[PDB]
Structures are given as structure tokens and as C-alpha cells.
Write a protein that binds this ligand. Structure first.
Ligand SMILES: *SCCNC(=O)C(C)(C)Oc1ccc(Br)c(OC)c1
Ligand SMILES: *SCCNC(=O)C(C)(C)Oc1ccc(Br)c(OC)c1
Ligand SMILES: [Mg+2]
Ligand SMILES: [Mg+2]
Ligand SMILES: [Mg+2]
Ligand SMILES: [Mg+2]
Ligand SMILES: [Mg+2]
Ligand SMILES: [Mg+2]
Lengths: 236, 5, 236, 5
């Protein structure tokens, strides 16, 4: 690790600076170094890790979609042949994206998940595992595609089972997990009815529990509930 | 695209 | 060069793809590879080179400014000591920025400027040379700062002298050079009166030549004239 | 910041 010589606390401090400067690649590298110190992460530190990689891979996904669309148009009838360059460059971006996903999955497997015993940590890491397998599935076209999809499903499912047993229905991590697993069903698994059912039941069961919350918790939960509603509106 | 967090 | 094995035309094609995907680091790497083929660049290719590096260094400058502001606040009275991390990370971003500027300046010196004989190429490369020395000056605090400032000044001045002799006053490259040299005077050289004079005279001499232009050229020239006006409004 | 191109 190039971060092996930097103090854990300094890595965390610099991750926060990198976030302020919108330097998400640096942020991710600092958080990878922090994870590799071997200690468990606090709630705030788990948020830093997830924000850094979500922004890095989100930019890669957006670029991959632009290039994939150009590549599809180049393969339509009446399109002038332009050579291998579009495919090559799409492949370059795809391979980088896969590398980032493999890095995150590697941190989760070595050894964040196995030491995560509380629901708030374990559900969040298993949600991340589902997310990064989902990003791998978005670009998969080969003989492991079904296994990649199933890996995402299995991680999400374990997170769901824990979240339903151990968290209230308004817990933001439970809500965000459900939001993303619902998207998995709709976009990856060819299961729009499951996606819709999950989003609706999650939203309704959260609504019924809002009365138990403080004003600040209510704000946190309703924010994610609105995302579930936005997806339901998109899908119906 | 749909919303994810 | 990692791009040494890729065809020039393929590098240009991929630079255009990278621009569409907003992958400016890749764009810059592809254009560096294209320059290193040793052939002169067309007008479109000079635009690709400048767009790629302007976006890369522009992001570095924005991040450096965020970090420098945090570092200044940390050095005020009543600020709790936070250790060397802010300075270290500002220095990391600064060193990367300097590396990009040195790379661009190196391409200009080896050998774009010396083979550029037409005004449209030579003025544009000398403007770039001024710009990247200006970016080095923004972060300079040491014993070479005056020489760095003078290097920017000298490049801008040579570009100005050529532009006034060889281009009409509405030429967009002449206008953009004047815009940036005016900013150099205001922000780098502690010469706001020179900055204002240059912007005003450039704007007025362009106005008087608009009557000679087609509708499309008029659009191109008035776009940059409005930037000169925006700066004049900021400064007066 | 002022405008540059
Ligand atoms: S962890 C980063 C801080 N949180 C957030 O940015 C928002 C979207 C406000 O909250 C949530 C809520 C639930 C989840 Br699972 C996440 O995951 C990143 C974020
Ligand atoms: S070279 C990139 C294409 N041009 C532009 O983006 C705009 C700003 C429209 O035009 C100009 C005009 C004059 C100059 Br010197 C530049 O330099 C990049 C750009
Ligand atoms: Mg230590
Ligand atoms: Mg591939
Ligand atoms: Mg169920
Ligand atoms: Mg060749
Ligand atoms: Mg320095
Ligand atoms: Mg003069």
C-alpha cells in the first residue's frame, strides 16, 4: 500500500479534505489506505468510504454509458465503419470500472464484512457488496454474467434479511438498501414487479413508523422515502 | 436512470 | 510514451470520444500522444489539446484554491492546531498541478512552437505558454516566482506582438489572448490599470471591425468580446 | 474569478 506509511487518522483527515475539494479519486485512495490499517470503521468512516467510491464509479458508469451508446450507434445499419477505436476505448473505461469494483469488493471481503457484527455496519457493507456487483453486472456480457448477478442478489438478500430483523422500518440504511435492491430488480434482474412491490412496501412500512421519530430522524428517513416514491413514479 | 444511494 | 504504439488518427479519434464522455485526463493523454508523433497540429487538433489540458488543470486549480483557503484559515489566530495534513495535501495537489503545467510547457517547447509559422498556430501556442506559466505563478511562493511571472509575460507579449501585426482585431484567438493577458496583468502582475486598459482597447478595436464579418464570424467574435466586457464590469 | 479562455 502506497498509504502504508501514513497514519490512520491522517488518512481520514485527508479523505475529508479531498471530499471538500471534490477530489474523489484521492478520497477513495485515502479511505482504501484507512481500511487497510485493519481496524473496523466508524459510521462516519463508512460514509467516507462509500461516498468516495460511489463518486469514482459513478463517473466511470456515466462515461461507459456515453461510449456504449456511441458504440451501439456505430453498429447500426447505414453507419460508416470507423475502426476498432470506439470499442477499444469503451473497453478501456470498462476495465478501469471493473478494477474499481474489484478493489471495493476486495476491501469488503478482506476483511470489513467478516468483522462487522452490528446491523448498522453489516447491512451497510452488504449493501455495498450488492451495489458493486450490480455495477459489474451492468457491463457484463460474458459467461459469468449470471453468477455476477447472483452475487449481487445474494449480498442484497443477506442485507435485507438482517435489516428486517434488526432495524426499524424507517432506518435510513434499511431504506437505502431497499431502494437499491429494488433498482437491482428493475434494471438488472428483469423483475420490474418485484422492484415495484419492494419499493411500495418499504415506503408504506416506513410511513407507518415515522410517528416514532424526532424531527431530525424524520428528515433523514423522509429523504430516502422520497427517492422510493420517485422511482415508483418513474415505473408506473 | 432511477435513484440509488 | 505509453501512446507510442497507437496511430495518430486513433489518438485524435479517442480524444474526441473522451471529450464526449467528459474524461479529460484521458483526453489529455491521447492528445499528448498525438503531439509526440512529431507532426504539426491542425486548428481542430490544437483546440483538442487546449481543451483537454484546460479542463485537467482547471480542476486542479479549483481544488488547490479550496485547500489553500482551508490552510489559510488553519493559520489564523485562535485556530486549533490540526497537524501537517492540510499543508501536505495542498502540496500534493500543487505538485500534481505543476506536473501538468510542466508537461504542457514541454510539449510546446518540444517542438510545437518552433515549427509554428502561421499566426493562428503560433499565437495560440504562445498564449498557451503564457497560460501555463500563469498557472505556475498562481502557486509560486519561492525564489523563482519572479522568473515564472516573467516567463508568462514574455510568452503573452510575443503572442500579442504577432497578433497585432498578423490578425484582424476581431480574430477570436487575438481576442482570447488579450482576455487572458489582461487577467495576467490584473491577477498575477499587480497591474490592474494595464489589465483594464488592455481589455477596453481590445473590445473597442474589435467593435469597430465587426462590420467586416459574416454572421457566423460575428457570433464567434462577440462571444469573446462579452468576456472582455464581463471582466471590465468586474474590475470597475 | 475573472474570465479566461
Ligand atoms: S453515508 C453518506 C451520508 N449519507 C447520505 O449522503 C444520504 C444519502 C443523505 O444518506 C444515506 C442514507 C442511507 C444510505 Br444506505 C446511504 O448510503 C450511502 C446514504
Ligand atoms: S479551441 C476550443 C474551441 N473554442 C472555444 O471553446 C471558444 C471559447 C468558443 O473559442 C475560443 C476562442 C479563442 C480562443 Br484563444 C480559445 O482558446 C481555447 C477558444
Ligand atoms: Mg498509527
Ligand atoms: Mg470487457
Ligand atoms: Mg420479500
Ligand atoms: Mg501511423
Ligand atoms: Mg510546493
Ligand atoms: Mg500595449
Amino acid at each position: 500500500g502506497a498509504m502504508g506509511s501514513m497514519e490512520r487518522a491522517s488518512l481520514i483527515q485527508k479523505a475529508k479534505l479531498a471530499e471538500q475539494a471534490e477530489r474523489y479519486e484521492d478520497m477513495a485512495a485515502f479511505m482504501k489506505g484507512a481500511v487497510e490499517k485493519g481496524e473496523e470503521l466508524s459510521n462516519e468512516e463508512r460514509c467516507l468510504l462509500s461516498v468516495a467510491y460511489k463518486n469514482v464509479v459513478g463517473g466511470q458508469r456515466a462515461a461507459w454509458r456515453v461510449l456504449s451508446s456511441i458504440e451501439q450507434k456505430s453498429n447500426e445499419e447505414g453507419s460508416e465503419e470507423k475502426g476498432p477505436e470506439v470499442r477499444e476505448y469503451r473497453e478501456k473505461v470498462e476495465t478501469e470500472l471493473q478494477g474499481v469494483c474489484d478493489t471495493v469488493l476486495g476491501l469488503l471481503d478482506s476483511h470489513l464484512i467478516k468483522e462487522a457484527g452490528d446491523a448498522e455496519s453489516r447491512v451497510f457493507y452488504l449493501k455495498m457488496k450488492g451495489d458493486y456487483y450490480r455495477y459489474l453486472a451492468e457491463v457484463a456480457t460474458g459467461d459469468d454474467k449470471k453468477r455476477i448477478i447472483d452475487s449481487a442478489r445474494s449480498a442484497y438478500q443477506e442485507a435485507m434479511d438482517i435489516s428486517k430483523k434488526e432495524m426499524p422500518p424507517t432506518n435510513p440504511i434499511r431504506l437505502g438498501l431497499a431502494l437499491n435492491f429494488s433498482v437491482f430488480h428493475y434494471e438488472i434482474a428483469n423483475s420490474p414487479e418485484e422492484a415495484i412491490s419492494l419499493a411500495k412496501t418499504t415506503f408504506d412500512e416506513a410511513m407507518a413508523d415515522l410517528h416514532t421519530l424526532s424531527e431530525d430522524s424524520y428528515k433523514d428517513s423522509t429523504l430516502i422515502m422520497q427517492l422510493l416514491r420517485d422511482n415508483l413514479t418513474l415505473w408506473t | 436512470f432511477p435513484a440509488t444511494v
